[PDB]
């Protein structure tokens, strides 16, 4: 699901240098076990910026014809420091051209932010509150459009839309609507922050978010978490967890999993599979650091093939191996992480079924998944839910929730089956 294009970029070193920072090398790896040299920052008014072709996150293949393959960080630095003022770079761009193709909530084509804000104010001030209008609008606009609605609402009423909705709404409907009004990174960061209660930490919610978010999402959550709460997320994980569960949660929350390379490393797939077996089912006890490193460092496609090759060696697959090897929060985090790796849409489909199958509703889990995945992979979640449970996700939301709260959730579902 990416696009790679190689390009030669020729720059002139001006009075303030080439104008970008490089990360990487065999001893300062950009992501896990990746020795490539990458562009981290690009300085305004610099040579690279004024040129425009080089982008943040580019991989630098060579400098003046000299390859930056398997170099120490200093040797890569030295090639730049000792190049002339005319520097020729071969660069590899990595692209993401997907967006919300599998989300259920699409951008409204006839969007009018000022009009939406007016209609929402009117629905708010109406005697008794017009919840239906509020739900109809916000659950049928994309997250970014909701931001523009919120901005215009403040501009018109000189009051924040979220504050007005805290007073006009209640119950589970308020929880959904307030969740939709946050950006994805803000929603996840606030859900993570709300889970940390010292010894009473909501580990299930930590596991859900940290095990299912990608590198890009996690790096944005990390950035937004520090802005909102003036403390790094990793520090909050450290002071709210312990033991191997903390190490796993810290490692995943760094968001530095290896990106899927073009070549498939079949030798490393087999070796990782053997290591997971040797560290667990094959021995007395468990080498947990070995599981943590492998399951957090390797790319998701690579690990998908590792777990299948694992069944060639182990009488038990990875999931039932975990249930036989570890307990408690550690076992639950491993089970969630492996499901996310093997089939993330199915992972959320099973969680949604879990939140509704029994008595009552785990509304916190149901709402968080319906909100956070509505613009990511909700169509895939619905497909996996339908295939496994025979009836639709729409149907289960219908039987388990009522009123305008049900209406908003069904809108985020997007349709039947």
């Amino acid at each position: 699901l990416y696009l790679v294009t190689e390009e030669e970029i020729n720059l002139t070193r001006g009075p303030s240098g080439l104008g970008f920072n490089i990360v990487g090398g065999t001893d300062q790896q950009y992501v896990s076990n990746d020795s490539g040299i990458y562009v981290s920052r690009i300085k305004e008014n610099g040579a690279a910026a004024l040129d425009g072709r080089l982008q943040e996150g580019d991989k630098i293949l060579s400098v003046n014809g000299q390859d930056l393959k398997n170099l120490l960080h200093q040797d890569a630095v030295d090639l730049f420091r000792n190049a002339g003022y005319a520097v020729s770079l071969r660069v590899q761009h990595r692209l993401q051209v997907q967006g919300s193709a599998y989300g259920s909530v699409k951008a409204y084509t006839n969007f009018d932010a000022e009009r939406d804000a007016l209609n929402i104010e009117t629905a708010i001030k109406t005697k008794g509150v017009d919840e239906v209008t509020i739900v109809n609008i916000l659950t049928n606009r994309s997250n970014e459009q909701r931001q523009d609605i919120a901005f215009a609402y403040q501009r018109r009423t000189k009051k924040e839309l979220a504050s007005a909705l805290k007073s006009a709404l209640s119950g589970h409907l308020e929880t959904v609507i307030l969740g939709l009004l946050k950006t994805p990174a803000q929603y996840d960061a606030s859900e993570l922050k709300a889970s940390m209660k010292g010894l009473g930490t909501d580990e299930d919610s930590l596991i859900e978010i940290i095990c299912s978010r990608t590198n890009q999402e996690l790096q944005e959550i990390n950035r937004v978490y520090k802005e909102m709460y003036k403390t790094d997320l990793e520090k909050d994980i450290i002071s709210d967890t312990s033991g191997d569960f903390r190490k796993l949660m810290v490692a995943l929350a760094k968001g530095r999993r290896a990106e899927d390379g073009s070549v498939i490393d079949y030798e490393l797939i087999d070796q990782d599979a053997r290591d997971l077996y040797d560290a667990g089912v094959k021995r007395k006890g468990t080498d947990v650091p070995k599981w943590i490193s492998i399951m957090t460092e390797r790319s998701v496609p690579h690990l998908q093939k590792v777990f299948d090759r694992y069944k060639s060696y182990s009488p038990y697959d990875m999931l039932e191996s975990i249930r036989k090897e570890v307990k408690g929060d550690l076992e639950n985090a491993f089970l969630n992480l492996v499901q996310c790796i093997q089939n993330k849409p199915l992972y959320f489909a099973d969680r949604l079924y879990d939140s509704m199958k029994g008595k009552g509703t785990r509304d916190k889990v149901l709402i968080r998944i319906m909100v956070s995945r509505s613009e990511v992979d909700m169509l895939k979640i619905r497909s996996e839910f339908k295939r496994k449970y025979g009836k639709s996700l729409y149907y289960y939301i219908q039987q388990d929730t009522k009123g305008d709260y049900q209406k908003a959730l069904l809108y985020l579902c997007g349709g039947d089956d």
């Binding site: 080439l18 970008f20 920072n21 490089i22 990360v23 981290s40 630095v77 730049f80």
Partner: peptide, 6 residues
């Protein structure tokens, strides 16, 4: 964190 300015 941080890389190297070039």
């Amino acid at each position: 964190g941080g890389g190297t300015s070039v």
